[PDB]
Amino acid sequence: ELVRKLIFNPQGDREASKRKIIKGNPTNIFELNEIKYSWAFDLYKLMGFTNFWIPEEIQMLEDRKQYETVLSDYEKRAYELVLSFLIALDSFQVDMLKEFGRMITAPEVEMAITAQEFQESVHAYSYQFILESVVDPVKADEIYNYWREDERLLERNKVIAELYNEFIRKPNEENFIKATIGNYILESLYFYSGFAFFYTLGRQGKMRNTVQQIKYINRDELCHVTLFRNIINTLRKENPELFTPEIEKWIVEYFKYAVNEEIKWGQYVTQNQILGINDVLIERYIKYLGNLRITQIGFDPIYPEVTENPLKWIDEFRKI
């Protein structure tokens, strides 16, 4: 079991050089005059100060009209499904990041995760503002609760939980790597059917207010992916005993599964009824994301057939 560190360890190492992501021997004073993990402190500053944003300073005068009239029945169904799921995801994230933060022994990394946890809270605030602004009170509740109706949404949610619940029940080193990899996958993939969709509506001038909110959320998710990419790669070097062949295998499995499921969710939401998104065009996106993120944490591409981002336009569109 990963023994959760005492609030203060007077027998703790003074040398910042002796810090470890996990299983270190810190004082648990945030001795930030010496930083071992420069990327953790930089990412704290970027998430906490540089990229700071206020969801209510984004004006939402247009979208309530476009929803009521201009949007098709299929476009409203998607909007509902995507926002319901992203509300689920960010909710799981604010809660699970408290688990990671309390197990990590490097103060600069703990700081980066506190900043991440806060950004996840701002997202929860952004979605509440989107629904308060765009739709009516009953519809807003319905969207928050759309897992209660839709089995493909409910199962999406129970699945993401299960992997996080393994670590909470059995807080061992194996279930920590799993939970960490799951966090990276959730941040890597599970936002991007949703992001691609909203950026599609925005390409033809639909829900450009919601899309503004999304650009800010998506800027945050890149930093989060960047934070956990560094954490996984640093855990490789510092704890190679934990990356057994059984784990190295399991990582490739879940990543392939996750790419598969995100694609299908992308298809169940759109269904070729959205002017810009094809059931095929979803694949080449999620497949390119999978390769990008799994190779970035030191693996072989899991879909070598794909070696090009189909939606390259996004990278310029998403920008602020």
Size of the site for a second copy (CB under 8 A): 64
Which lies closer to a second copy via its Cβ, residue 75 or residue 99? 99
49 binds a second copy (CB under 8 A): yes
Among 20, 77, 178, 224, binds Fe ion (CB under 5 A): 224
Q: Which is nearer to a second copy, 106 or 294 (CB)?
A: 106
Give the nearest distance from C-beta 14 to a second copy in angstroms: 6
Contact positions with a second copy (CB under 8 A) in 60-119: 87-88, 90-92, 94-96, 98-99, 101-102, 107, 110-111, 114-115, 117-118
Q: Write out the binding residues for Fe ion, residues 163-202 only, by CB under 5 A.
A: 187
Give CA–CA dist 28/8, Å, rounded: 6
Partner whose footprint covers residue 7, from Fe ion, a second copy, none (CB < 5 to 8 Å by kind):
a second copy
Structure tokens at 57: 């300073």
| Binding partner of residue 224 among a second copy, Fe ion, none, CB cut-off 5 to 8 Å per kind | Fe ion
Instruction: Evaluate whether 102 touches 34 at the Cβ level (below 8 Å).
Output: no
What is the rounded (10 degree) CA torsion for 42, 97, 256, 284?
Answer: -60
Choosing among a second copy, Fe ion, none, which partner's interface includes residue 8 (Cβ < 5 to 8 Å by kind)?
Answer: a second copy
42 in contact with a second copy (CB under 8 A): no
Type of residue found at 199: Y
Q: Is the dihedral of CA 219, 319, 86, 152 positive or negative?
A: negative
Query: Min. distance of Cβ 297 from a second copy in angstroms?
Result: 23
146 is catalytic: no
Task: Check residue 157 for interaction with a second copy (CB under 8 A).
Answer: yes
Which one of 41-49, 183-191, 232-240, 262-270 is the stretch in contact with a second copy (CB under 8 A)?
41-49
Of 37, 39, 44, 192, which lies in the binding site for a second copy, with binding defined by CB under 8 A? 44
Q: In b/e form, how buried is each residue of 64-98, taking b as 16+ CB within 10 angstroms?
A: eebbeeebeeebebbbbbbbbbbbbbbbbbbebbe
60 binds, among Fe ion, a second copy, none (CB under 5 to 8 A by kind): none
Task: State the nearest-atom distance from the C-beta of 313 to a second copy, in Å.
Answer: 32
- Chosen residue from 11, 33, 240, 308 binding a second copy by CB under 8 A: 33
Catalytic residue among 37, 44, 67, 127: 127
148 binds a second copy (CB under 8 A): yes
CB of 138 to Fe ion, least distance (A): 29
Which residues contact Fe ion by CB under 5 A? 187, 221, 224
The site for a second copy (CB under 8 A) is made up of: 4-8, 10, 14, 28-34, 44-45, 48-49, 52, 54, 56, 87-88, 90-92, 94-96, 98-99, 101-102, 107, 110-111, 114-115, 117-118, 120-122, 124-125, 127-128, 131-132, 137, 140-141, 144-145, 147-148, 154, 157-158, 160-161, 164-165, 168
Catalytic residues: 127
